[PDB]
Structure formats: C-alpha cells, structure tokens
Amino acid sequence: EIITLQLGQCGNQIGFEFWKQLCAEHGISPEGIVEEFATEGTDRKDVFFYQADDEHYIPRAVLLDLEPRVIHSILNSPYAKLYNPENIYLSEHNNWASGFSQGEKIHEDIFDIIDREADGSDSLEGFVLCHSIAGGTGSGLGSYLLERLNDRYPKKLVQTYSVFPNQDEMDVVVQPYNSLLTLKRLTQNADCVVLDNTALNRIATDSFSQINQLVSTIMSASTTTLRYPGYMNNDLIGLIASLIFLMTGYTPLTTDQSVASVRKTTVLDVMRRLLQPKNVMVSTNHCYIAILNIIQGEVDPTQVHKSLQRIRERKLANFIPWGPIQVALSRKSPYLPSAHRVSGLMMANHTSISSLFERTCRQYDKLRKREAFLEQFRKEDMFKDNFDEMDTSREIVQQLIDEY
C-alpha cells in the first residue's frame, strides 16, 4: 500500500490526472463503481485504492492547498464524487517562508488525516509526494510535511515527483529561494523523480492537461509492476535498492492521432530509444549511475539478452569507473487498447543532473549578493531574525554537487 501527498496547484492537478489514469487502467468507474466486464478482475487494487462497503473504491489520496479554486474545480468534475471529502483539506482563507509557517500552524489536522489513512492499511510501504518546488504553496508545505513525516514515521519510504521551474523561460520571480530550500529538505529527508517544464514541453512539442497527462503516464508506468504482481520486483523497496536523484523517459509518448504509424516495435529498438538524451524528459565526462527499463507487452527474454549484448558492445552508454543495468518486465492492463506491440519506460540516475543545481545555485548566488525580494521573508518568524537557514541550505547543496 501507499499514500499520495499532493500540494499546490501543480500537485493537485498531477493527482487529478494520475487518478484518472489509474481508474482508466483498473476499470474503476468515475463514481467509484466497478464495471461489469471488470467484475472478475485479477489486478491488485489495494495498492492505490481501498474498497468501501458500498462496493465503491476510494483513493489513498489527500488534497492540500493554500487556495480553494483548484480543488473546487476538481469537485465540479465528473470524478468529483470519487475522492474522500474527509481527507480533502482547504485553507479557510507565493512564498516558501509563509508556506512553512502555515505548515507549523496546521500540523494537527493534516497529521490527523494522515494517521487515519495510515491505520487503514496493513502493509503500507512508503509515501508518494507530488508538488512543484517553485511556487510558495508546494515548496514550503512539502518541506514542512517531509520534515515532520521523516520525524514521525522513521520506517516508511518517501518518494516524490518534484517539478522544477523552467529556466530558458525566465515563472516564480522568487523561485531560487524556494527551489534551494526544497532541495535542502529533499536531500536531508527524501528517500528518493526530478521533473522540469522546459524539457517536458520540449518533448511534448517535438495545455497543462496534456503535460500532466504525460507525467501521470510516467507515474503509472513506474508503479505498474507493483500494481500488477509478477515474479521479480514485487515491491517499491526492490525498485529503490536497484538504483540508489533520478530522471525518466517513456518511449510510446504518442498522441491519440499519431497511431497511424504502427511501427514494428521490438524490445531492442525501445530499450535503445530510452537511452538518448532527447527522450530524457528533463533538460566533466558525466556518466550514469544506474539504469532501469520496465517493458510492457509481449517480451522474449532472448530478445532482451540480445539487445543488452548489442548495446553493451556498441558502448552507447558510459558508466562509473569505480563500480560495476536492469531490465524488468511487466504485463499491460487487460483493458486499455494495446496500440503498442511492446512499450518501454526508463528511470535512471546520471551524474549530469548535477548541472540543474549548479544553475539554481548560480541563480541564487546571483541574488543573495544584492538582497532581492527578502522583504516578505523577513515577515515570517523563521526568517524574522536572520537567514542562516539559507546559508546552510546553500552549503548543503554545494556539498551534494561536490559529492556528485
């Protein structure tokens, strides 16, 4: 089992479309009813859903937000009735310090909800977090929740889908501070999926609805095998151990109109495609640390071995000199059309990601020398006296970059 903590407008939407994808996959009706064709289903549902006496299924989700508008719109959707009104929380009434201050203020009810959800699962495995690191809501609230959660639950995993601000595009003027602080908290508490609007929209090209549909696709494909038990990799901890910051790529990212080219898609061509920098959805002979490829559809392990052999000989990849990939196979949901003969998702750890922080650090250093937009931060208690928090966070990020 698992819980999802989605914050800010970004996280709220991310959750909306993630649950849309899930209910589509598992044959869950918008109202929580189960379709007749899926009555005898074999798919495991406990992982993301828990059924109710009324036979309906409820997501293990909690909605958090500093503002009402987004969730109010969500509850006007056809999927509104599905969620649990008890879990959803809205502030009665764009800065990280303010977000953390509110988090300190509203500890009690949030952790009440989290405890209630936790006690309903026998074998909870970890946590899932969806949020954006730039905006005031996501950054600060996620920081506070991560801190108090790692404190509260020292034996549960914490996984996040953190969305990083666009850089080529000059959105949050105060983004460097929030990003740097959120990164501090991620290193200091997060167990383990980086995301950026820049490269994501780049691949989308070459509304937020479609972008986050792709993101939800990534999340669902990541959790597929856990959802669909097989032989190997039957747990999230198995995933994490086989890799341990990450980046992702998915081959069949094709529009509903781009099915006309039914290209004979082997496993070799897919696994190859997952390697190119173009497909890496995120934007010094930098090299890899780990690679995992989850493959959906018919697959012959002989083909997998041949592809691995050929790629190894062709040396299209580079590895650490000081240490000695993985190809897991799953089964598609029996419901969604198998427009793709075989499909592939890749999650990897690669040193080049360091550059991200070097940019943000460069951004942050490009402001701290002139004290820009610190007036609001001084208002909050945390930065009321000084900003030693900022210095510690910057040095922590520098240490991480040095370690990479």
């Binding site: 383990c192 032989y231 190997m232 994490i240 151990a241 086989s242 341990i244 392990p301 002989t302 240490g323």
Partner: protein, 192 residues
C-alpha cells in the same frame, strides 16, 4: 539444523488427475520449491539491506559495503533472472504441447520432459555449479546480517570479518567464471 532446510509444500490431488500426478512427479516439484524459495529468501533479505544503506544517508572503509553489496547483488539478481526465462519458456512449451496433440499419451511424456528440463536447466542436477553457487547463497546471509546486526561503522572486528568473505567471494566469483567458459550461454551472457 535450520528450519528452512526442512520446509516443503504437499498437495492433496483430486481423483481424476491421480494418475498424472504420482508421488514421484509430485516430489521433484517439491525440490524445485525448496531451491527457488531459498534464492527468493536471500534476494528479499539482500535488498532490505539496500533499503537501509540508502536509508543510512546522514568512513573511508564503510564504503566497501556497497562496493561489495552490488557485486553480491548483480550476481544474485540476474541469477534470479534466467528463471523467469526458463519457467515462462519451458512452461509455454508444456502448455503448447497440450493443445496440439489430441492424444493423451503425449501429455504423460510432454509433461514428464517439461519436469526433467527444469531439473536440468536450473542447474539443480549439475553438481559442480550447484555446490559453488550454494556457497554464494549462505554467503549473503553472513554479509546482510553483519550490516543489520549493528548501526555503526565496521570497527569492532566487523571490518576484520568483512575482508574475510571478499577473499573468498571474489575467489568464488572468478571460480564460477572458469566453470562456464549448452545451457550456460543464456546465463553467462547476462552477467557479461
């Protein structure tokens, strides 16, 4: 005598298939369940340690752990592969030989040959490899325990015990390498 060494699973067969599943054939099945569970036991055990090393993010010699853990991981995880590709491959033939021949005499032989392949393919009958990888099996029990039996750096004779196995493991590692140099081609390819 450890309890796991005696574990097994018996099956009360019904009346019609009483002729197809004798105590002989239902016994060779059990031997597969004994071995396949062991590899499953060490793998599930081994990865939990990984769930702690990554967890233990806040010693110049403590880093030798993961530089040995991953070595013990790849040899094990990919050894745990070729299994989904000897089961799901031999089984997919056993089921195909069924829906083809209207005769029943074939089933008693197709199923019998299916069973003999598992004992032959999975190296359970091949004594040398089965007596070398077995040493790798209980080897991880010692290492995984060593990391779990404490929470500090390997100083209190742990490092003194750590360098013991690597002199045997890496020796056992390359020892296996000469053994494979018919059926190993599907296996040695993945590790190499």
């Amino acid at each position: 005598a450890s309890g796991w060494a005696a574990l097994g699973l018996s099956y009360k067969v019904q009346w019609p298939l009483h002729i197809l599943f004798t105590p002989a054939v239902l016994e060779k099945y059990n031997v597969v369940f004994k071995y396949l569970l062991s590899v499953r036991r060490v793998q599930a055990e081994l990865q939990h340690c990984w769930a702690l090393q990554m967890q233990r993010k806040h010693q110049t010699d403590a880093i030798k752990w993961r530089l040995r853990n991953h070595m013990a991981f790849l040899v094990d995880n990919l050894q745990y592969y070729l299994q989904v590709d000897v089961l799901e491959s031999q089984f997919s033939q056993l089921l195909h030989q069924i829906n083809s021949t209207r005769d029943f005499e074939s089933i008693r032989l197709a199923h019998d040959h299916f069973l003999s392949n598992l004992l032959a393919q999975s190296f359970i009958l091949l004594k040398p490899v089965f007596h070398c990888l077995n040493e790798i099996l209980d080897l991880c029990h010692s290492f995984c325990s060593l990391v779990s039996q404490n929470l500090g750096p390997l100083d209190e004779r742990g490092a003194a015990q750590l360098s013991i196995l690597v002199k045997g493991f890496s020796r056992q590692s390359s020892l296996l390498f000469k053994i494979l140099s018919n059926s190993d081609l599907a296996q040695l390819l993945l590790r190499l």
